């Protein structure tokens, strides 16, 4: 049970995540949206990165914001699953399908980097489908993205989900490039989508971080030369030699006929 039925012209339905994310239908429009609930004391802080970039097809866009007494209700167009769940269910993606989806993922990251943001927490789970047919994806949100103060993308604090953590973060003596780190993560996603398992895995983190530091991963021979070439241009490169999010988009793999 909930205390209210409606926020503005939006009928509330059911919680998708605790008391934080609610389903909603616009009463005049009849369209189904998703409503994320923040405290008014810290909502414009949390949402600051969402107002840095121009709108992009593969980055969730805020539809409306309704300010209550105690809470701010931020509305988004709904999703239809996530990439992680999709890869698990499918086991692995065909190169044709993977190329379509990964191009959208890379485009989203390229938009963030070139607009002066680093994500820091990139995972498959963070990308969610826009349509029922699960052909279009978008970055779920930019809430926890770091806004660069000028050009410099140097980060001191270690961030990331262990599987997506780059070697530069682990054996860091202070600063590292946030953009290079986000690109590393893109490599892991691409591998995981195509192969159906993480490139680096182990029993416990310390052993996992050893494999990453040394670059202990294998690519199946079954993947196409171009697919393999793209993987290694991210995961088997030091930041200075490693592709940028934008450069990924020009890669010959996407241009294949399939």
């Amino acid at each position: 049970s909930h205390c209210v039925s409606c926020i503005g012209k939006y009928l509330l339905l059911e919680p998708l995540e605790g008391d934080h994310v609610f389903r909603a239908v616009h009463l005049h429009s009849g369209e189904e949206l998703v409503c994320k609930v923040f405290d008014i004391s810290c909502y414009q802080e949390s949402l600051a990165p969402c107002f840095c970039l121009s709108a992009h097809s593969n980055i969730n866009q805020i539809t409306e914001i309704i300010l209550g007494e105690t809470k701010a209700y931020v509305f988004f167009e709904r999703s239809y699953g996530d990439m992680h769940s999709f890869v698990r269910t499918c086991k692995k993606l065909r190169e044709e399908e993977a190329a379509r989806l990964f191009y959208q993922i890379a485009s989203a990251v390229a938009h963030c980097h070139d607009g002066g943001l680093v994500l820091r927490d990139l995972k498959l789970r963070k990308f969610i489908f826009k349509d029922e047919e699960r052909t279009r994806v978008k970055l779920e949100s930019l809430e926890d993205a770091y806004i660069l103060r000028g050009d410099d993308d140097s980060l001191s604090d270690k961030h990331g989900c262990p599987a997506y953590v780059s070697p530069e973060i682990l054996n860091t003596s202070g600063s590292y490039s946030g953009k290079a780190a986000d690109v590393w993560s893109l490599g892991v996603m691409l591998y995981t989508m195509l192969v159906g398992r993480y490139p680096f895995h182990d029993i416990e983190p310390s052993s996992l971080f050893s494999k990453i530091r040394r670059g202990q991963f294998n690519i199946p021979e079954t993947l196409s030369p171009k697919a393999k070439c793209l993987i290694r241009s991210i995961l088997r490169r030091e930041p200075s030699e490693r592709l940028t999010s934008q450069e990924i988009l020009d890669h010959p793999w996407f241009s294949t006929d399939f």
């Epitope: 039925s5 409606c6 503005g8 012209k9 009928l11 239908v25 616009h26 009463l27 005049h28 429009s29 009849g30 369209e31």
Partner: nanobody
Framework: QLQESGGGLVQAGGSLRLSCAAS????????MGWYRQAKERELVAG???????YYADSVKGRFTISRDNAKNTVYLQMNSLKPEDTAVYYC??????????WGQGTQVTVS
């Protein structure tokens, strides 16, 4: 003042049709839909005055909703009736100062 109809019993795989009308001073822009309890009250189907609809994930493709703005009434056609769908179906009409009218309840069983 919501007068409704259509309650019945049916074999697993059959079909029922529900209907509800309102003859009062309700808004032209008023949203209309059907909830069911059985368990708690969830919205199974809804429809805006511009005919754009919502369906619960469980009943997508199986159930259908439509409103006649002239008569000021809303219908809920349901097919391939599962055993789980057994519940009391309350019609609702919502406006937005703010109004929210319920129906008495139309029972429908599956076996």
């Amino acid at each position: 003042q919501l007068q409704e109809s259509g309650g019945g019993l049916v074999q697993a795989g059959g079909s029922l049709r529900l209907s509800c009308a309102a003859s009062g001073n309700i808004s032209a822009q008023a949203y209309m839909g059907w909830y069911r309890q059985a368990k708690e009250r969830e919205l199974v189907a809804g429809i805006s005055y511009g005919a754009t609809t919502y369906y619960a994930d469980s009943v997508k493709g199986r159930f259908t909703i439509s409103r006649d703005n002239a008569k000021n009434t809303v219908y809920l056609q349901m097919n391939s009736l599962k055993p789980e769908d057994t519940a009391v179906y309350y019609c609702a009409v919502i406006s937005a100062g703010y109004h929210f009218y319920w129906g008495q309840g139309t029972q429908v069983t599956v076996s």
